[PDB]
Symmetry: C3
Subunit: 430 residues, 3 copies
C-alpha cells in the first residue's frame, strides 16, 4: 500500500510538473490553465509526441479566442522526460489515456463500431476502454471491459507475433472472468489453431454472459492534467503524501480543485458537470442510483442531458462561447472496485418470492415468476448459471459509502434503495 501509494504519487507528481511547465510555455494565466479544453489539448500533445498541436483558448478583451499552435514532438518529449525526473515515465502517459478513455466512455456510444464487429449494440456497459489502443499499458489492460476485449479479439480473427498477441489478449480476457466455465471457454478460443467463426461465435456468447455473470474490470479515477498541476503548484506534495486511484484521494483532490469549461449557447452547465464527474470516477456504466447517492444530486441519463461533448471543434465560432465552472464535488465517496460482483457461491439464499393469503380480501397474489419457473457443455453450464441469477441479488455485502472526512474508510454507510446511463434514446426506453 505505502509502496503502491509511493509510485502512484510520483507519476501524478510528474504529470503535475509537466502541466505547470507547459502552462508557462504557452504563457497561460492560472484560470486559463484550469480550463478543461486547454488541459485536453496539452494532454493530447504529449500523447501524440510519443509536429504536434491543437487548439488553445485565451481571454482577450472580454472574449474567448481560439489559437491553434504547434510544437516539435522532440521538444515535448524532452519536456515530459524532464518533468518526470529523467525517466521515460510511460505510466503517467497511460494515465492520461485512461482519463481520455473514461471521458469518451461517458460522451460517446460506440454502437457504429459494435455493429461492424458483429456485436449487440446493447453491450455498451461492457465497453470500458474501447477507444483505448490495442496493446495499451498494464493499467490499460486492467481498465478494459469484457466487451472491449471481445471486440479486439474479433478484429484479430477478421507474422507469428500475431499468435502471441492473440494469446496475450485471451489471457487478459480469461483473467477477467470470475467463473471457471467462462474461463474454460476462453481456453477453447485460445488453444484453437487458425481462429475463425467458431471463436467469433464463442466470444459473442462470452460477451452476453458478462452482462449477467460480470467480469472483473478495474476502475480508476483519472483526472485532467490541470487538476494535478494546479495541486503541485499550490503546494501539495504527491510524493510525500502518496496518492491512490481507488481510495479517497481523487475525491479529496476534486473537493480542493476548481476546473472550468467552455459552454455553448444552449447547454446546461450542470449537465456538462455531470459528464466530467462521471468520466473522472470512471462511472459511465454504473447504476445511476449509486452515482446519484454518492454525488449528492441526481445523475441523469445521457439522453436527458442538455449537453454535447467537452471538445469544441474547429468549425464552431468562438464569439458565442462562454466559460462555466464544472461542479465536480460529491456528498460522499466510495472505493473504486475491480470486482464484477457476485457470480457464483450460490451458498443458500435467504428471501421471499411469494405470499400466503391470511385475510379474505379481493386482490392479486404476487409471486416472483421468472425465479420460480427458472428451476424447471461449457455453454450449457454457463446458460444454467446465468439462468440462476436474479436482478434482485445483492453484491458487495457490507461495503458502503464514506464521509469525506473518513480517510481510513472506518464507517461505511450502506444506502437504501433509472439505472442505465445509455438506456434512454429514440429507439429504446430502458
Amino acid at each position: 500500500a505505502t509502496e503502491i501509494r509511493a509510485s502512484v504519487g510520483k507519476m501524478i507528481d510528474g504529470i503535475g510538473r509537466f502541466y505547470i511547465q507547459m502552462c508557462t510555455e504557452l504563457k497561460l494565466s492560472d484560470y486559463e490553465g484550469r480550463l478543461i479544453q486547454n488541459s485536453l489539448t496539452i494532454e493530447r500533445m504529449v500523447l501524440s509526441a510519443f509536429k504536434t498541436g491543437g487548439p488553445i483558448y485565451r481571454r482577450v478583451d472580454g472574449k474567448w479566442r481560439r489559437e491553434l499552435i504547434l510544437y516539435d514532438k522532440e521538444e515535448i518529449r524532452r519536456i515530459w522526460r524532464q518533468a518526470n525526473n529523467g525517466d521515460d515515465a510511460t505510466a503517467g502517459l497511460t494515465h492520461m489515456m485512461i482519463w481520455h478513455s473514461n471521458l469518451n466512455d461517458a460522451t460517446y456510444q460506440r454502437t457504429r463500431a459494435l455493429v461492424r464487429t458483429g456485436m449487440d449494440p446493447r453491450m455498451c456497459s461492457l465497453m470500458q476502454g474501447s477507444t483505448l489502443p490495442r496493446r495499451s499499458g498494464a493499467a490499460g489492460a486492467a481498465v478494459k471491459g469484457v466487451g472491449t476485449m471481445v471486440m479486439e479479439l474479433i478484429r484479430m480473427i477478421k507474422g507469428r507475433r500475431t499468435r502471441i498477441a492473440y494469446e496475450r489478449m485471451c489471457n487478459i480476457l480469461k483473467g477477467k472472468f470470475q467463473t471457471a466455465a467462462q474461463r474454460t471457454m476462453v481456453d477453447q478460443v485460445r488453444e484453437s489453431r487458425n481462429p475463425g467463426n467458431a471463436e467469433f461465435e464463442d466470444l459473442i456468447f462470452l460477451a452476453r454472459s458478462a452482462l449477467i455473470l460480470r467480469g472483473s474490470v478495474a476502475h480508476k479515477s483519472c483526472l485532467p492534467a490541470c487538476v494535478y498541476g494546479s495541486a503541485v503548484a499550490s503546494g501539495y506534495d504527491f510524493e510525500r503524501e502518496g496518492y491512490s486511484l481507488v481510495g479517497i484521494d481523487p475525491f479529496r483532490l476534486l473537493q480542493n480543485s476548481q476546473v472550468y469549461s467552455l459552454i455553448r449557447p444552449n447547454e446546461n452547465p450542470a449537465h456538462k458537470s455531470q459528464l466530467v464527474w462521471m468520466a473522472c470516477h470512471s462511472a459511465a456504466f454504473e447504476d445511476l442510483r449509486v452515482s446519484s447517492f454518492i454525488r449528492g444530486t441526481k445523475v441523469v441519463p445521457r439522453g436527458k442531458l442538455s449537453t454535447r461533448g467537452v471538445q469544441i471543434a474547429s468549425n464552431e465560432n468562438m464569439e458565442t462561447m462562454e466559460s462555466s465552472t464544472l461542479e465536480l464535488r460529491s456528498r460522499y465517496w466510495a472505493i473504486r472496485t475491480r470486482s464484477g460482483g457476485n457470480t457464483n457461491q450460490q451458498r443458500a439464499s435467504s428471501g421471499q418470492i411469494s405470499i400466503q393469503p391470511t385475510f379474505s380480501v379481493q386482490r392479486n397474489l404476487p409471486f416472483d415468476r421468472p425465479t420460480i419457473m427458472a428451476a424447471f457443455d461449457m455453454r450449457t453450464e454457463i446458460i444454467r448459471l446465468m439462468e440462476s441469477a436474479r436482478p434482485e441479488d445483492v453484491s458487495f455485502q457490507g461495503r458502503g459509502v464514506f464521509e469525506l472526512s473518513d480517510e481510513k474508510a472506518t464507517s461505511p454507510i450502506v444506502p437504501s434503495f433509472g439505472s442505465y446511463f445509455f438506456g434512454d434514446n429514440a429507439e429504446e426506453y430502458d
Copy 2:
C-alpha cells in the same frame, strides 16, 4: 390531399344537413339537438332505414321526458338522399356506423363473444370494429382490428359466394399484417380448400402475434351527427374548407362544439366525458399515458370510471335524469395513424441492458433478464420474431403531439414518459 379533403368535406357536410333537417322535423330546440342521446337515436334511425324509431328526449316544465316515436323508412331514406345532394351517399352512413363502433369499443368488453369464437378474452386491444357488420364499407374494413378479422373468419369456418367472401376477408387481414411471415400464414389459410380446425388454429396464432407484431389498423375520429349539424347550422362550410378524419379538423371542431349528455344519479359527468372523448378519437385501445398527455387531464381505466353507457334504456325512469355538458376538448392534438408501430427492421439497437459496478457499495446489480436470455416453419419464424420484441422498443420515432394552433403540424412536441383501458377488473389487475 385536397381531393381527399374535398370528398370527406362533402360527406360530413351531408350528415350535417341531414341532422338539421331531422332536428326541425322533430321540432327540437338547438340544445336538445345537441344532446348525445338524441343524436344516437337519429343516427340509429337513418341506419335502420337503410317503420323505424327510438327514444327522443325533450325538456318540458323543468323535467326531462322520454317520448319514443317512429318514422317511415322510406321518408328517412328520402330525407338522407336529399340532404346529400341527390346521391345515395353510402360513405356518410358508414361514417356514423364507425362512430357507433368506436363508442361501443370504449363502452363494452366483447369477452362473451370472444369465448364463443374460441379466442382469448385478453385480445380486446385487437377488437376495433367488432360490433361492425361483416361486409361493412371500405372505411369499415380499414378500421377493423386484426382480432376482429380473425373472429369474423372463424364464424365463417364454423354458395360459392361464400368462398369469395372468405378470400376477401383473408386479403383484408393480410393487408393489415406488417411482416412477411404473418402474411404467408394468411396465404396458407386462404389457399386452403374447405377450411376447418387447422385454419382455426392458424388464425388464433396470428391473433396472438398481433399483440406483439401489431397489424396496420386505421383510426378515424368520427363524431356524433349533432356535432357536424351544429357546425353546418352555425355557418361552417365543410365543402369549402375541406375536412380530415386523421388531421387536426375533428380536434378543432370539438374545440368549437358543445355536446350534452343525460347523466344518471350516481354517475360522474367527468367520467362520462372521458368515455365519449375516447370514442370520438378512436382511442379505446390506446396507451392511457398518451391519451392523458393529449387530453390534458388523466384518462382513467374503465374499471375506475364511475359511469355506465351513454344510452338510457326504456326501463329506467326519466324523473331522476339530469343533463350535463360533455368535456370533449384537449390540451394538444395528434395525427391519427394507420400504423401498428415498428414490427421488423431490426437495424442495430442502441441502448443499455446491464451495468458494470464502479463503486464498492452494497446493492443489487440490475439487468434486463428477458432480453439477455432471449438470444439463447412460418410459425417458427413468427415466434423468433416476437421473441425479439421488447416492451421498451420505441415506435413512431420523431413524431409527436401538436398545439391547437399548429394546423400544418409544423412543430412536434415529443412527450416524456397504467397503459390499458380494460386492464382493471375483478379478475385481473393489469
Copy 3:
C-alpha cells in the same frame, strides 16, 4: 357456528382463568400480568408441564428486575386442569402453541433448517407452523403450511407406526392441495413402499408449485394468554358471548386490550408493535400491502424493522430495560381465510395485455410479455398449470375488509391497489 363459537369460547375462557390463577400465584400486579414477556413464560411453563420454569419480570423501586423461578409440573398440570372445569383440555394448549408458532413465524427465518432438508430457503412463505412439533393437534395440522408438511416428510424419509405416521402426513398435505394434479402426486409419494430420493424430488417439486398454485392453509388469530385472562378478569364472558378465531372477535378483543413489552435501548417500540400484531393475526407471510391497509399504518419488512425478538435472554442486563405499550389495534378488520386463492377454474379471462396505437406519437408500445409468450405426466400437467398463472390474477373476488362496528360482516370494503415481509436482507432485495 353457534356450536363452534361455544367450544372456542370455552377454551379461551379456560386459558383466561388459568392465567389469572397463575398471576395470583406469582403475586403479580395487573400491569405486570399484562407484560408480554411474563405471558410467554407462563405459557411456556404450562406447555413444558405437559420441574419447570422461566424468567418473570417485576417492578421494584423504579427498575425492572428479572427473577427466574420454578414450579412442579404436577402443580401446574393440576392448575390447568382445574381452570378448565375438570377436563384435560388439550385444545387450549395447542392454541398457545399456535400463538408461539405465529410469533416465531414473524420473528425468525428458518433458512438454516431449510438447507439441511434440501429445500430452497426462498420458500419461507410456505413455512407456517414449522416450529410446531410433528404430530401437533388437529388445529396444528390445519395451521401448518405446505412447505412445513414437505419438510416434515423429508425428515421421515431421511416400527410400522412409522408408516402410518408417514401416510397421515401425506394426507394432511394432500388435503391442503387445491388441484387434482398436485393431489395425485401426493398419492404417488404415499403409495410408495420404502420412500427415498424419488419422493424427496417429488416433494421439492410440490413445494415449488405451492408458491404459485397455493395450498389451503388455515390462519388463526391466537393471542397471548394475558389478553384472554385480562378479559375474563375485567368481566367478559367468553362462554356466553362465544368466540371466533377467524371472525371479528380477536380484532375486537385487541381493540379493548392493552399489552406491554420490555424494550431494549436501541429498539423502536412501534416496530416491536408491528411484530406482535403480525403474529397475533398470523400475518407473517401476507402481502404487506393488505396488512398495511387493515392495520392503518404501514407494515414494514423485517429487514427495515429496528427491533429484535420479544424474549429477553438471560445474558442481557435488566438495568437498561424499559417497558413500552404495544400498539395492537387496527383501522379495519378482515376474515382470516383457509383458502390459498384461485388455483384453477380458468373460466375465461377478461382483461388487456397489449395496446393498439391510435396516435402517431414517439413512444414504447407496452405488452405483457410473459403472458403472451406463455401460450407457446402429472409434473407436466403441474408445470403447464403454473405457467398459466399470472401475478396479476385476482383471488377472493367480492370479499373485502370491514369496519370495527360491522360485526356481522355486512358491508365489505374492497381496497384499491413491497409485498414480502422477508424479501429485504443483505443477499436479496425483493
